[PDB]
RNA sequence: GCCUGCGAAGGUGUGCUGUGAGGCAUGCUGGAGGUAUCAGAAGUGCGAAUGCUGACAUAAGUAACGAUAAAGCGGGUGAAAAGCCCGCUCGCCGGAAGACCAAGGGUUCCUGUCCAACGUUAAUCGGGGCAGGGUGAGUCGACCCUAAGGCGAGGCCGAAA
RNA sequence: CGUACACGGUGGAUGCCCUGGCAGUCAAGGCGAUGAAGGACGUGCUAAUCUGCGAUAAGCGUCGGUAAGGUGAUAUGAACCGUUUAACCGGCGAUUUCCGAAUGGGGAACCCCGAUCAUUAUCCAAAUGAGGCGAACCGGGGGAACUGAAACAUCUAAGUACCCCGAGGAAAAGAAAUCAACCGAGAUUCCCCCAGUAGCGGCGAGCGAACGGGGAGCAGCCCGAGCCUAAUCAGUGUGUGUGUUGUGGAAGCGUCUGGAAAGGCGCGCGAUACAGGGUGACAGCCCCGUACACAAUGCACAUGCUGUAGCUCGAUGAGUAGG
């Protein structure tokens, strides 16, 4: 997700997307599970995207 | 100046004639052309010296010295690859001179 | 709800409960009080929990020479769940 | 104003010259620079302070290892076992080398794999080296309170911590 | 077993090199209650250190620059990011935990609030100040001794060492009830000189100016009443130059030696560009770079402008002069 499509989605939007992307970062704390199927990359994006979202959601 | 997104043309090493574009440039001095490799004892083409080690450096390391960028002067090389959004840079690249 | 938690566990130790008697092993973040633990869990996972226990840990230094080790490990809780079903899955 | 990888400075051995300080040549090594003249610049040329620091020889392969004085005989494992393990025999300690703890120390605990270093001999042993694992209380303790006494604030004194 | 040497060793000197120091010069110069400096603990897939950040954690956003590669020092393995143009280098904004001047209270970083002093005061802390830090410079107070005098009580070292309080980037002084070569000079510091002179001193040892002159730099002005107003005050617009830092880019012959020439010899060339570095050996013409020009930042001080506003009359400051 980028920027621009943060500032598009609604004040909703932004609540639902934090609250979903919260969701993932949980399922991501697979990583102490040792599990295979995870990825550095999201696991390092989704830190960003709660972040974003919740910047935008100052800039509103 | 020698940059990875030329391409290089070699004139003296074992590889004299081969084609390619550079990989990285080194602080050493050493630049890699894409082509110039090695084959490593499992046959890998990688690129490297010759000499039984362990644990290298890898690429060929060719000196700037003995390659072929483009070179104005009465010699066998030929064309070479080269920035543009640059503008001024394009003047130069138009002048048989300048580049 | 999906907050708080690490790896459901370990190899024996972590293993030879939930085997067949109620309890489960999990780790949780250090911060995670009561409140938590208790919510995260009994949430998530299809059961309600009772009794609550939350560990702390750390190692320390030394173990080599001339460098350098000053940290803190990381602590799992154990969280007692109720006579019914355990997590559903994994365990015995 | 000259020399040099058709090899310098330095070092080692050797030849020659000067009363000498010193200069110079040859061979080997080395393998990068090094001089002569005149005119300067100098943190400029040493054996000789129970001198300072580091290194090293002789002394010497010489002085030293003892109340909980305990090991011995078979066997196991192993490349190797006088002190790793099994059995037997034989002993030591008893307010104690027994059991539970405070302070203090703090992972040194357990398992597996090893041993170059450590264990004043050896080690297939270890509190040694490496990698993992371990310390799950409402009623135990902390947490809470106060004693001698101390501190901060107002009051009072060139000035003030 | 004595001595010299040879081969090897020990050892690390020596020779050469040096990504370090030492010294001088030019430029530039403050940081913090919108809670800093410092420290602690964290943060990278693996990371123990250092560095960078800090839980949006060796990073996030915007603009500009730059450029096709990059994921800090570490040139590992895996993986990933970049042309929806990143890495990297520069303005402004957002976020900015806890303690810390902290200031509720206690406390070896942990638990609950504008603490203390003070001003204004709608006396409600309601509106404000102080309480810390900073290499050493300037000012204001307190003030030794060893030592010299080849003893020592003046004197000397000292008004130094050390103690207290406070400012700035700079401080103190200052327009003369002065000087006193005169029909003369004429605000105050500082530099040179005058002087090692006058003067002081068991006149023993030692101590020690000033006026003036030559320079640097120059500026003079404010308190009772009458009258009236272009000094001041408030606000607006808002730079030049200069200084610092960053930025744009092409080109290599012959013979000999050599593994390779940036060698020797021969020939030729550029220069508002007779700095340095790199490149297989001493390259001004092989590459960067240097003239040149551009860009960013700081400078921002100033100037211009709006509304304010002259000038006049008398006196001139006692517990002081002085004892």
Redesign the pocket.
Known sequence: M??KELREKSVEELNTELLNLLREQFNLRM?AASGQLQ???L??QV??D???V??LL??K | ??????EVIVL??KDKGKRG??????S??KVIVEGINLVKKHQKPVPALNQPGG?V??EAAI????VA???????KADRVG??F??G??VR?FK?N??? | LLKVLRAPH?????S??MEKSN?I?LKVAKDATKAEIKAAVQKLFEVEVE?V?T?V?????????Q??????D?KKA?VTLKEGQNLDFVGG
């Open positions: 980028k920027a990583q990825q550095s990359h696991l390092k830190r960003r709660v972040a974003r919740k910047t100052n800039e | 100046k020698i940059r990875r997104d030329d003296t090493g574009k550079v990989k990285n440039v080194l050493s001095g644990i450096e890898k000196q700037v010295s003995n960028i483009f070179n104005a002067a009465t010699g080269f920035r959004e640059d001024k840079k130069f002048s001179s300048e580049t | 370990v190899s024996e130790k972590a030879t409960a309890t092993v009794v226990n560990l840990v750390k190692g320390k230094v030394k173990r080599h020479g460098r350098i080790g000053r940290r803190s990381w154990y």
